Amino acid sequence: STGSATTTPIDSLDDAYITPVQIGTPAQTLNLDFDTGSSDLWVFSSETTASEVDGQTIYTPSKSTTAKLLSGATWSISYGDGSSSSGDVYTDTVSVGGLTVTGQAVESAKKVSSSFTEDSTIDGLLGLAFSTLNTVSPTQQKTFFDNAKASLDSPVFTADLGYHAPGTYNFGFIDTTAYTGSITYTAVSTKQGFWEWTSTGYAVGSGTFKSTSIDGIADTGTTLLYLPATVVSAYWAQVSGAKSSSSVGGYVFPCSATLPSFTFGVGSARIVIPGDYIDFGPISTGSSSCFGGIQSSAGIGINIFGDVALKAAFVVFNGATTPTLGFASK
Ligand code: NA
């Protein structure tokens, strides 16, 4: 089997992407944030504290003929941005882009933090990291990908995120029409539960490529590119008037600037992030200070190849016995 679903930016900045997901019988369609940096499929629900719901579509298990309580199971998750959610668990039928899994753990939120409530466009998360990170207790649950894997034509999924435009998540096949050139595959460590890999270096604009190992994670649920402070300083040094602002919480730059590209290495191959992808717009409405899309990972404890980086590539998440990542230009 295969599946193919369109993913759509939630706003004009590409802050996140939402993908429609069918849950239950008859189908309830919720727009979920597919997150290769976490491993829980959780939704706003009929159980979510009413004051914490503001415009989201909810899953109502009592209206699904295939829902069953996973008795005694609870979940609770905290993300890198400080957000959190928790609740109980149902199993139900879940379909993505025509690919169906029966018996998927659907984590129903009883509580969500303010950042979730405030984002009316995201109805929950669908985790695509390794199932070792799933938070369900006392019986850890599998991701949608892990439950689908054995049925798929190939044990893979791909992320093809758009810049200010829709893109695609495919399951079970490579769309050879969706990228240019060849796919370069690179090793993955699953030791922290992430799609963790080592980039071979970077370049800023038309500058020379610096060969250096940068360990980090491929994380579709993170907006920005978080890299070591040395790398990030070298990038922003090429933008007149850019500075790190402790008050704003990262590098800012004059909205009048034209940003340089940023290249990262994948083995001997190179992915180029256009400068425009690194502009996250005014820090507050009407400001002439703009927020940068490349930020320091110092204090986060891991480098993160978030959407800024991934949307410059066609990315293969290869879930074979030995997982690997692939990157192609597009
Ligand atoms: Na921000």
CSV table of C-alpha atoms and ligand atoms in Angstrom, one decimal:
chain,number,residue,atom,x,y,z
A,1,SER,CA,0.0,0.0,0.0
A,2,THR,CA,0.9,3.7,-0.3
A,3,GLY,CA,-0.6,7.0,0.9
A,4,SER,CA,-0.1,10.6,-0.4
A,5,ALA,CA,-1.4,13.7,1.3
A,6,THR,CA,-0.9,17.4,0.7
A,7,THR,CA,0.6,19.5,3.5
A,8,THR,CA,-0.3,23.2,3.7
A,9,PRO,CA,1.4,26.1,5.5
A,10,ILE,CA,-0.8,27.4,8.4
A,11,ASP,CA,0.2,31.0,7.7
A,12,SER,CA,2.2,33.3,5.4
A,13,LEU,CA,5.5,32.6,7.2
A,14,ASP,CA,5.3,28.8,7.0
A,15,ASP,CA,5.3,28.6,10.7
A,16,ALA,CA,4.0,25.0,10.5
A,17,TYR,CA,2.2,22.8,8.0
A,18,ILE,CA,-1.0,20.9,8.4
A,19,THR,CA,-2.1,17.7,6.7
A,20,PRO,CA,-5.7,16.3,6.8
A,21,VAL,CA,-6.1,13.0,8.6
A,22,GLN,CA,-9.2,10.8,8.7
A,23,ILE,CA,-9.9,9.4,12.2
A,24,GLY,CA,-12.8,7.0,13.1
A,25,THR,CA,-15.9,5.7,11.4
A,26,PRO,CA,-17.5,7.6,9.9
A,27,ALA,CA,-14.4,9.6,9.2
A,28,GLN,CA,-13.6,12.7,11.3
A,29,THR,CA,-11.1,14.8,9.4
A,30,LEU,CA,-8.6,16.7,11.5
A,31,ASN,CA,-5.7,18.9,10.3
A,32,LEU,CA,-2.6,17.6,12.1
A,33,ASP,CA,1.0,18.8,12.3
A,34,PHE,CA,3.2,15.9,11.1
A,35,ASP,CA,6.2,16.0,13.4
A,36,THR,CA,9.3,13.9,12.6
A,37,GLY,CA,10.7,15.1,16.0
A,38,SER,CA,8.1,13.4,18.2
A,39,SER,CA,6.2,10.1,18.4
A,40,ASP,CA,2.6,10.8,19.7
A,41,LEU,CA,-0.5,11.1,17.6
A,42,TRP,CA,-2.7,13.4,19.7
A,43,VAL,CA,-5.8,15.4,19.0
A,44,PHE,CA,-8.1,18.0,20.3
A,45,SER,CA,-11.1,16.1,21.4
A,46,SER,CA,-14.5,16.2,23.1
A,47,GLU,CA,-12.5,15.5,26.3
A,48,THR,CA,-10.4,18.7,25.9
A,49,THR,CA,-11.1,21.3,28.7
A,50,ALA,CA,-13.6,23.6,27.0
A,51,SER,CA,-11.7,26.8,27.8
A,52,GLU,CA,-8.6,25.4,26.1
A,53,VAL,CA,-10.4,24.9,22.7
A,54,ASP,CA,-10.6,28.0,20.5
A,55,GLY,CA,-11.6,27.1,16.9
A,56,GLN,CA,-9.9,23.7,16.5
A,57,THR,CA,-11.8,20.8,15.0
A,58,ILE,CA,-12.2,18.1,17.7
A,59,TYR,CA,-12.2,14.3,17.6
A,60,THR,CA,-15.3,12.8,19.3
A,61,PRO,CA,-14.6,9.1,20.0
A,62,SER,CA,-18.2,8.5,21.1
A,63,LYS,CA,-19.3,9.2,17.5
A,64,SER,CA,-16.9,6.7,16.0
A,65,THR,CA,-18.1,3.1,15.8
A,66,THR,CA,-14.5,1.9,15.6
A,67,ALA,CA,-13.1,3.8,18.6
A,68,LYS,CA,-12.3,1.9,21.8
A,69,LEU,CA,-10.8,3.2,25.0
A,70,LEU,CA,-7.3,1.9,25.6
A,71,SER,CA,-8.1,1.2,29.3
A,72,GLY,CA,-5.8,2.7,31.8
A,73,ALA,CA,-3.5,4.4,29.2
A,74,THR,CA,-2.5,8.0,29.7
A,75,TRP,CA,-0.1,10.3,27.9
A,76,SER,CA,1.8,13.6,28.7
A,77,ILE,CA,4.2,15.4,26.4
A,78,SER,CA,6.4,18.5,26.6
A,79,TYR,CA,7.9,19.9,23.4
A,80,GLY,CA,11.2,21.9,22.9
A,81,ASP,CA,9.2,25.2,22.6
A,82,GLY,CA,7.8,24.8,26.2
A,83,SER,CA,4.3,23.7,25.0
A,84,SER,CA,2.6,20.6,26.4
A,85,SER,CA,-0.5,18.4,26.3
A,86,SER,CA,-1.8,15.3,28.1
A,87,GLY,CA,-4.8,13.0,28.2
A,88,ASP,CA,-6.1,9.5,27.7
A,89,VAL,CA,-6.0,7.1,24.7
A,90,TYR,CA,-8.4,5.5,22.2
A,91,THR,CA,-7.6,3.1,19.4
A,92,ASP,CA,-9.3,3.8,16.2
A,93,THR,CA,-8.9,3.7,12.4
A,94,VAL,CA,-6.6,6.4,11.0
A,95,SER,CA,-6.1,7.2,7.3
A,96,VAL,CA,-3.6,9.5,5.7
A,97,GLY,CA,-3.8,10.2,2.0
A,98,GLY,CA,-5.6,6.9,1.3
A,99,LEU,CA,-3.3,4.7,3.6
A,100,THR,CA,-5.3,3.2,6.5
A,101,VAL,CA,-4.1,1.8,9.8
A,102,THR,CA,-6.5,0.0,12.1
A,103,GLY,CA,-6.0,0.0,15.8
A,104,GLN,CA,-3.9,3.2,15.8
A,105,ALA,CA,-3.4,4.8,19.3
A,106,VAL,CA,-5.2,8.2,19.1
A,107,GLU,CA,-4.2,10.2,22.1
A,108,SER,CA,-7.1,12.4,23.2
A,109,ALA,CA,-6.1,15.7,24.9
A,110,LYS,CA,-7.7,16.5,28.2
A,111,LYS,CA,-5.3,19.5,28.6
A,112,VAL,CA,-3.3,21.5,26.2
A,113,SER,CA,-1.0,24.5,26.8
A,114,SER,CA,-1.8,28.0,25.7
A,115,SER,CA,0.3,27.9,22.5
A,116,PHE,CA,-1.9,25.0,21.2
A,117,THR,CA,-5.2,26.8,22.2
A,118,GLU,CA,-4.0,30.0,20.5
A,119,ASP,CA,-3.4,28.2,17.2
A,120,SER,CA,-6.8,27.5,15.8
A,121,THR,CA,-5.3,25.9,12.6
A,122,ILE,CA,-3.7,22.9,14.3
A,123,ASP,CA,-6.0,20.1,15.5
A,124,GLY,CA,-3.2,18.0,16.9
A,125,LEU,CA,0.1,16.3,16.1
A,126,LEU,CA,1.0,13.2,14.2
A,127,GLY,CA,4.5,12.0,15.4
A,128,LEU,CA,6.9,10.4,12.9
A,129,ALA,CA,10.0,10.0,15.1
A,130,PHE,CA,10.8,6.5,16.5
A,131,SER,CA,8.2,4.8,18.7
A,132,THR,CA,10.7,4.6,21.6
A,133,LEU,CA,9.8,8.3,22.3
A,134,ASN,CA,6.0,7.7,22.5
A,135,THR,CA,4.7,8.9,25.9
A,136,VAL,CA,1.8,6.5,26.4
A,137,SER,CA,1.9,4.8,29.8
A,138,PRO,CA,1.9,2.0,31.0
A,139,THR,CA,2.0,0.5,27.5
A,140,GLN,CA,4.0,2.5,25.0
A,141,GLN,CA,2.3,2.8,21.6
A,142,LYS,CA,3.5,2.8,18.0
A,143,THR,CA,3.5,5.7,15.5
A,144,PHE,CA,1.3,5.7,12.5
A,145,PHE,CA,4.4,5.0,10.3
A,146,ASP,CA,5.5,2.1,12.5
A,147,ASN,CA,2.0,0.5,12.4
A,148,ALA,CA,1.8,1.1,8.6
A,149,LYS,CA,5.3,0.0,7.7
A,150,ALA,CA,4.9,-3.7,7.1
A,151,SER,CA,1.9,-3.0,4.7
A,152,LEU,CA,3.8,-0.4,2.7
A,153,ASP,CA,5.3,-1.1,-0.7
A,154,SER,CA,8.6,0.3,0.6
A,155,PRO,CA,9.2,1.1,4.4
A,156,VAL,CA,9.6,4.8,3.8
A,157,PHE,CA,7.9,8.1,4.0
A,158,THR,CA,9.0,11.4,2.3
A,159,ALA,CA,8.6,15.0,3.2
A,160,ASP,CA,8.4,17.6,0.4
A,161,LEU,CA,7.6,20.8,2.1
A,162,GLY,CA,6.8,24.0,0.2
A,163,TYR,CA,8.1,27.5,0.5
A,164,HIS,CA,5.0,29.6,0.9
A,165,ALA,CA,3.1,26.9,-0.8
A,166,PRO,CA,1.6,23.4,-0.3
A,167,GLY,CA,3.8,20.3,-0.4
A,168,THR,CA,3.4,16.6,0.1
A,169,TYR,CA,3.9,13.7,2.5
A,170,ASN,CA,4.1,10.3,0.8
A,171,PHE,CA,4.1,6.9,2.5
A,172,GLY,CA,5.4,3.8,1.0
A,173,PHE,CA,7.0,5.1,-2.2
A,174,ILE,CA,9.5,7.6,-3.7
A,175,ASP,CA,8.1,9.9,-6.2
A,176,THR,CA,11.0,10.2,-8.7
A,177,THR,CA,9.2,13.2,-10.4
A,178,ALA,CA,9.4,15.3,-7.2
A,179,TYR,CA,13.1,16.0,-7.1
A,180,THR,CA,16.1,16.8,-9.3
A,181,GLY,CA,19.3,14.9,-9.6
A,182,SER,CA,19.9,12.0,-7.2
A,183,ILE,CA,19.0,11.3,-3.6
A,184,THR,CA,22.0,11.2,-1.2
A,185,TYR,CA,21.5,8.9,1.7
A,186,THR,CA,23.2,9.4,5.1
A,187,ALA,CA,23.4,7.4,8.3
A,188,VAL,CA,20.9,7.8,11.1
A,189,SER,CA,21.4,7.2,14.8
A,190,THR,CA,18.1,6.2,16.6
A,191,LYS,CA,19.8,6.3,20.1
A,192,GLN,CA,17.8,9.5,21.1
A,193,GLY,CA,14.6,8.4,19.2
A,194,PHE,CA,15.1,11.0,16.5
A,195,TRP,CA,16.0,11.0,12.8
A,196,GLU,CA,19.5,12.0,13.9
A,197,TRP,CA,22.2,12.4,11.3
A,198,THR,CA,25.5,14.3,10.7
A,199,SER,CA,25.8,17.0,8.1
A,200,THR,CA,29.2,17.4,6.5
A,201,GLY,CA,29.4,21.2,6.7
A,202,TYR,CA,28.1,24.5,5.5
A,203,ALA,CA,28.6,27.6,3.3
A,204,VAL,CA,27.2,31.1,3.7
A,205,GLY,CA,26.1,32.7,0.4
A,206,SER,CA,28.7,32.3,-2.3
A,207,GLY,CA,31.4,31.6,0.3
A,208,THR,CA,33.6,28.6,0.5
A,209,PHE,CA,32.3,25.4,2.0
A,210,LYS,CA,33.5,24.6,5.5
A,211,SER,CA,33.9,20.9,6.1
A,212,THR,CA,32.8,20.2,9.6
A,213,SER,CA,30.5,17.5,11.2
A,214,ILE,CA,27.2,18.9,12.5
A,215,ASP,CA,25.1,16.3,14.3
A,216,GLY,CA,21.4,17.2,14.3
A,217,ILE,CA,17.8,16.0,13.8
A,218,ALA,CA,15.5,16.2,10.8
A,219,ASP,CA,12.4,17.7,12.5
A,220,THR,CA,9.4,18.7,10.4
A,221,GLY,CA,7.7,20.0,13.6
A,222,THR,CA,10.3,22.7,14.2
A,223,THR,CA,10.0,25.9,12.1
A,224,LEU,CA,13.5,27.1,12.1
A,225,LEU,CA,17.1,25.9,11.5
A,226,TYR,CA,19.0,25.7,14.9
A,227,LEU,CA,22.8,25.2,14.5
A,228,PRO,CA,25.9,25.8,16.6
A,229,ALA,CA,26.6,29.4,17.7
A,230,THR,CA,29.8,29.5,15.6
A,231,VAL,CA,27.9,28.6,12.4
A,232,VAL,CA,25.0,31.0,13.1
A,233,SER,CA,27.4,33.9,13.9
A,234,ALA,CA,29.2,33.3,10.6
A,235,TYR,CA,25.9,33.5,8.7
A,236,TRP,CA,24.5,36.6,10.3
A,237,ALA,CA,27.9,38.4,10.1
A,238,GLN,CA,27.1,38.6,6.3
A,239,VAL,CA,23.9,40.7,6.9
A,240,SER,CA,24.5,44.4,7.7
A,241,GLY,CA,22.8,45.3,10.9
A,242,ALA,CA,22.0,41.8,12.1
A,243,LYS,CA,22.4,41.1,15.7
A,244,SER,CA,21.4,38.7,18.5
A,245,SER,CA,18.7,40.2,20.6
A,246,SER,CA,18.3,38.8,24.1
A,247,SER,CA,15.0,40.8,24.4
A,248,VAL,CA,13.5,39.3,21.2
A,249,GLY,CA,15.1,35.8,21.7
A,250,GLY,CA,17.4,35.4,18.8
A,251,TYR,CA,19.0,36.9,15.8
A,252,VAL,CA,17.1,39.8,14.1
A,253,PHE,CA,18.0,41.7,11.0
A,254,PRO,CA,16.8,44.8,9.2
A,255,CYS,CA,13.7,44.1,7.1
A,256,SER,CA,15.4,46.1,4.3
A,257,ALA,CA,18.1,43.4,4.0
A,258,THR,CA,18.6,40.9,1.2
A,259,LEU,CA,19.6,37.6,2.9
A,260,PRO,CA,22.3,35.3,1.7
A,261,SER,CA,21.6,31.7,1.0
A,262,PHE,CA,22.8,28.9,3.4
A,263,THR,CA,24.2,25.6,2.2
A,264,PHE,CA,24.4,22.4,4.2
A,265,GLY,CA,26.2,19.2,3.3
A,266,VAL,CA,24.8,15.8,3.0
A,267,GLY,CA,27.7,13.5,2.4
A,268,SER,CA,29.4,15.0,-0.7
A,269,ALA,CA,26.1,16.6,-1.8
A,270,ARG,CA,24.9,20.1,-1.0
A,271,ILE,CA,21.4,21.5,-0.2
A,272,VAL,CA,21.0,25.2,-0.8
A,273,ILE,CA,18.5,27.2,1.3
A,274,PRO,CA,17.7,30.4,-0.6
A,275,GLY,CA,18.0,33.6,1.5
A,276,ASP,CA,14.3,34.3,1.2
A,277,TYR,CA,13.6,31.1,3.2
A,278,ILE,CA,15.5,32.6,6.2
A,279,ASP,CA,13.2,35.6,6.5
A,280,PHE,CA,10.5,35.3,9.2
A,281,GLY,CA,9.2,38.8,8.9
A,282,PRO,CA,8.7,41.6,11.4
A,283,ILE,CA,9.2,40.8,15.1
A,284,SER,CA,6.0,42.5,15.9
A,285,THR,CA,3.5,43.9,13.6
A,286,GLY,CA,4.8,46.9,11.6
A,287,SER,CA,8.4,46.6,13.0
A,288,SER,CA,11.4,47.1,10.7
A,289,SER,CA,13.3,44.5,12.7
A,290,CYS,CA,12.8,41.0,11.2
A,291,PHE,CA,13.3,37.6,12.8
A,292,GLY,CA,15.9,35.3,11.4
A,293,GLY,CA,15.3,31.7,10.3
A,294,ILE,CA,18.7,30.4,11.3
A,295,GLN,CA,19.2,30.6,15.1
A,296,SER,CA,21.6,29.2,17.7
A,297,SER,CA,21.0,25.8,19.2
A,298,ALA,CA,23.1,26.7,22.2
A,299,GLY,CA,21.1,25.7,25.4
A,300,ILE,CA,18.8,23.4,23.3
A,301,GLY,CA,21.3,20.6,23.6
A,302,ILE,CA,20.8,19.4,19.9
A,303,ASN,CA,21.0,20.9,16.5
A,304,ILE,CA,17.7,20.9,14.6
A,305,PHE,CA,17.2,20.8,10.8
A,306,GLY,CA,13.7,22.2,11.0
A,307,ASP,CA,11.4,23.3,8.2
A,308,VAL,CA,13.7,26.1,7.0
A,309,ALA,CA,16.2,23.5,6.0
A,310,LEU,CA,13.9,20.6,5.1
A,311,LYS,CA,11.7,22.6,2.7
A,312,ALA,CA,14.8,23.2,0.5
A,313,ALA,CA,15.0,19.5,-0.1
A,314,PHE,CA,13.0,16.3,-1.0
A,315,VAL,CA,13.6,14.3,2.2
A,316,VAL,CA,13.4,10.5,2.5
A,317,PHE,CA,12.8,9.0,5.9
A,318,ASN,CA,13.9,5.4,5.3
A,319,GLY,CA,12.5,3.1,8.0
A,320,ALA,CA,14.3,-0.1,6.8
A,321,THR,CA,15.9,-2.3,9.5
A,322,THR,CA,18.8,0.1,9.5
A,323,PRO,CA,17.2,3.5,9.1
A,324,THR,CA,18.7,6.2,6.8
A,325,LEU,CA,17.8,9.7,5.6
A,326,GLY,CA,18.0,10.8,2.0
A,327,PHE,CA,18.1,14.3,0.7
A,328,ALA,CA,17.7,15.6,-2.9
A,329,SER,CA,17.5,19.0,-4.4
A,330,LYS,CA,14.2,20.0,-6.0
B,1,NA,NA,8.8,33.5,17.1
